[PDB]
CSV table of C-alpha atoms in Angstrom, one decimal:
chain,number,residue,atom,x,y,z
A,1,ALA,CA,107.5,130.4,116.2
A,2,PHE,CA,107.8,130.0,112.4
A,3,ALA,CA,111.5,129.7,112.6
A,4,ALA,CA,111.0,126.7,115.1
A,5,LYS,CA,108.4,125.0,112.8
A,6,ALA,CA,110.9,125.7,109.9
A,7,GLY,CA,113.8,124.0,111.8
A,8,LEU,CA,111.7,121.1,112.8
A,9,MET,CA,110.8,120.5,109.2
A,10,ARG,CA,114.3,120.7,108.1
A,11,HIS,CA,115.3,118.4,110.8
A,12,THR,CA,112.5,115.9,110.0
A,13,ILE,CA,113.1,115.8,106.2
A,14,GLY,CA,116.9,114.6,106.9
A,15,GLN,CA,115.5,112.0,109.3
A,16,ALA,CA,113.0,110.7,107.0
A,17,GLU,CA,115.5,110.3,104.5
A,18,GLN,CA,117.8,108.5,106.7
A,19,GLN,CA,115.1,106.1,107.7
A,20,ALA,CA,114.0,105.3,104.1
A,21,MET,CA,117.7,104.7,103.1
A,22,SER,CA,118.4,102.6,105.9
A,23,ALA,CA,115.0,100.4,105.4
A,24,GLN,CA,115.9,99.9,101.8
A,25,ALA,CA,119.4,98.8,102.5
A,26,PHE,CA,118.0,96.3,105.1
A,27,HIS,CA,115.3,95.1,102.8
A,28,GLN,CA,117.8,94.5,99.9
A,29,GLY,CA,119.9,92.5,102.3
A,30,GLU,CA,117.1,90.7,103.8
A,31,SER,CA,115.9,89.4,100.4
A,32,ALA,CA,119.2,88.3,99.3
A,33,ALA,CA,119.6,86.3,102.6
A,34,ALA,CA,116.3,84.9,102.0
A,35,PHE,CA,116.9,83.9,98.6
A,36,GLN,CA,120.3,82.2,99.5
A,37,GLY,CA,118.4,80.2,102.0
A,38,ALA,CA,115.6,79.3,99.9
A,39,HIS,CA,118.2,78.4,97.0
A,40,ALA,CA,119.8,76.1,99.3
A,41,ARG,CA,116.6,74.3,100.4
A,42,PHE,CA,115.7,74.0,96.7
A,43,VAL,CA,118.9,72.3,95.9
A,44,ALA,CA,118.9,69.9,98.8
A,45,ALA,CA,115.0,68.9,98.1
A,46,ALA,CA,116.0,68.3,94.5
A,47,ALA,CA,118.7,66.0,95.5
A,48,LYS,CA,116.2,64.1,97.6
A,49,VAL,CA,113.8,64.2,94.3
A,50,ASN,CA,116.8,62.6,92.2
A,51,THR,CA,117.4,60.0,94.8
A,52,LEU,CA,113.7,58.9,95.0
A,53,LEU,CA,113.2,58.9,91.3
A,54,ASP,CA,116.0,56.2,91.2
A,55,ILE,CA,114.5,54.1,93.8
A,56,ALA,CA,111.3,54.4,91.8
A,57,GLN,CA,112.9,53.3,88.8
A,58,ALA,CA,114.8,50.3,90.6
A,59,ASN,CA,111.2,49.1,91.7
A,60,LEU,CA,109.6,49.3,88.2
B,1,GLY,CA,103.8,78.7,86.5
B,2,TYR,CA,106.4,76.0,87.8
B,3,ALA,CA,105.1,75.7,91.3
B,4,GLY,CA,101.8,74.0,89.9
B,5,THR,CA,103.7,72.1,87.2
B,6,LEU,CA,106.1,70.6,89.8
B,7,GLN,CA,103.1,69.6,92.1
B,8,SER,CA,101.2,68.0,89.1
B,9,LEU,CA,104.2,66.1,87.8
B,10,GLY,CA,105.1,64.7,91.4
B,11,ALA,CA,101.6,63.7,91.7
B,12,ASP,CA,101.5,61.9,88.3
B,13,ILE,CA,105.1,60.0,89.4
B,14,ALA,CA,103.5,58.9,92.7
B,15,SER,CA,100.2,57.8,91.2
B,16,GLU,CA,101.9,55.9,88.2
B,17,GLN,CA,104.3,54.1,90.8
B,18,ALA,CA,101.2,53.1,93.0
B,19,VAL,CA,99.6,51.4,89.9
B,20,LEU,CA,102.9,49.8,88.4
B,21,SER,CA,104.6,48.7,91.5
B,22,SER,CA,103.6,45.1,91.8
B,23,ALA,CA,106.8,44.0,94.1
B,24,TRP,CA,108.5,46.6,96.0
B,25,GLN,CA,112.1,45.6,96.6
B,26,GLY,CA,113.6,45.9,100.1
B,27,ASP,CA,117.2,46.5,99.1
B,28,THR,CA,116.3,49.9,98.0
B,29,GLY,CA,116.2,50.9,101.6
B,30,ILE,CA,112.4,51.7,101.7
B,31,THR,CA,108.9,50.3,101.4
B,32,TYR,CA,106.3,51.8,98.7
B,33,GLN,CA,104.7,53.7,101.9
B,34,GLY,CA,108.0,54.8,103.1
B,35,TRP,CA,108.9,56.1,99.5
B,36,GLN,CA,105.5,57.8,99.2
B,37,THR,CA,106.0,59.5,102.4
B,38,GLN,CA,109.4,60.7,101.5
B,39,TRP,CA,108.3,61.6,97.9
B,40,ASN,CA,105.4,63.9,99.0
B,41,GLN,CA,107.9,65.6,101.7
B,42,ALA,CA,110.6,66.0,99.0
B,43,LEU,CA,107.8,67.6,96.7
B,44,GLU,CA,106.6,69.9,99.3
B,45,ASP,CA,109.9,71.2,100.4
B,46,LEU,CA,110.9,71.6,96.7
B,47,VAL,CA,108.0,73.6,95.7
B,48,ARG,CA,108.0,75.9,99.0
B,49,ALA,CA,111.7,76.5,98.3
B,50,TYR,CA,110.8,77.5,94.7
B,51,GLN,CA,107.8,80.0,95.8
B,52,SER,CA,110.2,81.5,98.2
B,53,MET,CA,113.2,82.0,95.8
B,54,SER,CA,110.8,83.6,93.0
B,55,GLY,CA,108.2,85.6,95.3
C,1,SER,CA,104.6,51.9,81.8
C,2,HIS,CA,108.6,52.0,81.7
C,3,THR,CA,108.9,54.3,79.0
C,4,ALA,CA,106.0,56.4,80.6
C,5,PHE,CA,107.9,56.5,83.8
C,6,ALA,CA,111.0,57.4,81.9
C,7,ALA,CA,109.1,60.2,80.3
C,8,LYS,CA,107.9,61.6,83.7
C,9,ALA,CA,111.2,61.2,85.4
C,10,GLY,CA,113.1,63.1,82.7
C,11,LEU,CA,110.5,65.9,82.5
C,12,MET,CA,110.6,66.2,86.4
C,13,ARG,CA,114.5,66.5,86.2
C,14,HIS,CA,114.3,68.9,83.3
C,15,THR,CA,111.6,71.0,85.1
C,16,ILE,CA,113.6,71.3,88.1
C,17,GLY,CA,116.4,72.9,86.5
C,18,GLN,CA,114.3,75.1,84.5
C,19,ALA,CA,112.4,76.2,87.9
C,20,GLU,CA,115.8,77.0,89.4
C,21,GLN,CA,117.1,79.1,86.5
C,22,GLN,CA,113.8,81.0,86.4
C,23,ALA,CA,113.7,81.7,90.1
C,24,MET,CA,117.3,82.9,90.0
C,25,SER,CA,116.5,85.2,87.1
C,26,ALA,CA,113.3,86.4,88.9
C,27,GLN,CA,115.3,87.2,92.1
C,28,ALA,CA,118.0,89.3,90.3
C,29,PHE,CA,115.2,91.2,88.4
C,30,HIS,CA,113.2,91.8,91.6
C,31,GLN,CA,116.4,93.2,93.3
C,32,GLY,CA,117.0,95.4,90.3
C,33,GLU,CA,113.5,96.6,90.1
C,34,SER,CA,113.6,97.5,93.6
C,35,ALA,CA,116.8,99.5,93.7
C,36,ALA,CA,115.6,101.2,90.6
C,37,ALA,CA,112.3,102.2,92.2
C,38,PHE,CA,114.1,103.5,95.2
C,39,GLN,CA,116.4,105.3,93.3
C,40,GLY,CA,113.8,107.0,91.2
C,41,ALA,CA,111.7,107.9,94.4
C,42,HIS,CA,114.7,109.0,96.3
C,43,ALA,CA,115.6,111.5,93.6
C,44,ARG,CA,112.1,113.0,93.7
C,45,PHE,CA,112.2,113.4,97.3
C,46,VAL,CA,115.5,115.1,97.2
C,47,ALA,CA,114.2,117.5,94.7
C,48,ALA,CA,111.1,118.2,96.7
C,49,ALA,CA,113.2,118.5,100.0
C,50,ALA,CA,115.2,121.1,98.1
C,51,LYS,CA,112.2,123.1,97.1
C,52,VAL,CA,110.8,123.1,100.6
C,53,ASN,CA,114.2,124.1,102.2
C,54,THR,CA,114.3,126.9,99.2
C,55,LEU,CA,110.7,128.3,100.2
C,56,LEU,CA,111.4,128.0,104.1
C,57,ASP,CA,114.7,130.1,103.3
C,58,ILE,CA,112.5,132.6,101.5
C,59,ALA,CA,109.9,133.0,104.0
C,60,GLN,CA,112.4,133.4,106.9
C,61,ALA,CA,114.1,136.0,104.9
C,62,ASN,CA,110.9,137.9,104.2
C,63,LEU,CA,109.3,137.5,107.6
C,64,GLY,CA,112.5,138.6,109.3
C,65,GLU,CA,112.0,139.4,112.9
C,66,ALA,CA,108.2,138.3,112.4
C,67,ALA,CA,109.5,134.8,112.1
D,1,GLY,CA,105.3,107.4,110.6
D,2,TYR,CA,107.3,110.1,108.8
D,3,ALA,CA,104.4,110.8,106.1
D,4,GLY,CA,101.8,111.9,108.5
D,5,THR,CA,104.3,114.0,110.6
D,6,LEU,CA,105.7,115.6,107.3
D,7,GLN,CA,102.2,116.4,106.2
D,8,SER,CA,101.1,118.0,109.5
D,9,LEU,CA,104.1,120.1,110.0
D,10,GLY,CA,103.7,121.3,106.3
D,11,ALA,CA,100.1,122.1,107.2
D,12,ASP,CA,101.3,123.9,110.5
D,13,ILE,CA,103.9,126.1,108.3
D,14,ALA,CA,101.2,126.9,105.7
D,15,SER,CA,98.9,128.1,108.5
D,16,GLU,CA,101.6,130.0,110.4
D,17,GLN,CA,102.8,131.8,107.2
D,18,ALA,CA,99.1,132.8,106.4
D,19,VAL,CA,98.8,134.0,110.0
D,20,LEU,CA,101.9,136.2,109.2
D,21,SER,CA,100.6,137.5,105.9
D,22,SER,CA,100.6,141.1,106.9
D,23,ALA,CA,104.4,140.7,107.5
D,24,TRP,CA,105.2,139.4,104.2
D,25,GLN,CA,107.3,141.7,102.0
D,26,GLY,CA,105.6,141.8,98.5
D,27,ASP,CA,108.6,143.3,96.6
D,28,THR,CA,111.4,140.8,97.3
D,29,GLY,CA,110.7,138.2,94.4
D,30,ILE,CA,108.0,135.4,95.1
D,31,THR,CA,104.5,136.9,96.3
D,32,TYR,CA,102.6,135.9,99.3
D,33,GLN,CA,99.9,133.8,97.4
D,34,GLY,CA,102.6,132.4,95.0
D,35,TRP,CA,104.6,131.0,98.0
D,36,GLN,CA,101.4,129.4,99.5
D,37,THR,CA,100.6,127.7,96.0
D,38,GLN,CA,104.4,126.6,95.7
D,39,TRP,CA,104.5,125.4,99.4
D,40,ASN,CA,101.4,123.3,99.1
D,41,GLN,CA,102.7,121.6,95.8
D,42,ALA,CA,106.1,121.0,97.4
D,43,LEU,CA,104.7,119.3,100.3
D,44,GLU,CA,102.6,117.1,98.3
D,45,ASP,CA,105.5,116.3,96.3
D,46,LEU,CA,107.5,115.6,99.2
D,47,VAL,CA,105.0,113.4,101.1
D,48,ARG,CA,104.3,111.2,98.0
D,49,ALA,CA,108.0,110.9,97.2
D,50,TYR,CA,108.7,109.7,100.9
D,51,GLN,CA,105.6,107.1,100.5
D,52,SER,CA,107.1,106.0,97.2
D,53,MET,CA,110.7,105.5,99.0
D,54,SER,CA,109.1,103.5,101.8
D,55,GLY,CA,106.6,101.6,99.7
D,56,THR,CA,106.5,97.6,99.5
């Protein structure tokens, strides 16, 4: 039935839109969280590098 | 391109230390080998975190 | 030797700070780029969807009982 | 997998409108062929915009 296929298309457009919006929101949040974790790990590593540079200097 | 620069600088520091360090002091809490292991691990962690942050 | 170590230690400390600032700026840019790209594509999708719904409305009206 | 579903549904509707071409009123505005042409461009635009939204 044309009307059935037309109904299905209208429904599917709305679903596709909702899926894409949701995925973008998820991906923005996942990126933000991954950056914060990475940044924390970078800062911790840099602290160690600074401690180790001082040790090197003391042993020159 | 900071990843490669951090790695190369890190290697230069380690290799300088290896040639300069004629009498490692024990009161600094490690041996040369202990320092080298920790240095290379710190650099790895540092560079991997940077690459995650930027892409 | 010692001034050589000082040079390298100083550059490493400087480079770590620069890398951090660069990476923070890169992330902010990437989040903005992703959002702008989505918004644009979403606006195109909405316009196209409205065209499709319009054309379906016309087809249903035209075909009437034949739909 | 909405891109494929939208594309295939859109092709189904194009086919059905063509199958019902004899029932198409030609004095209401947009013509039978006009509709086919506009439908196929809208569908392409829709599918491509959806892929743009989803696209890493």
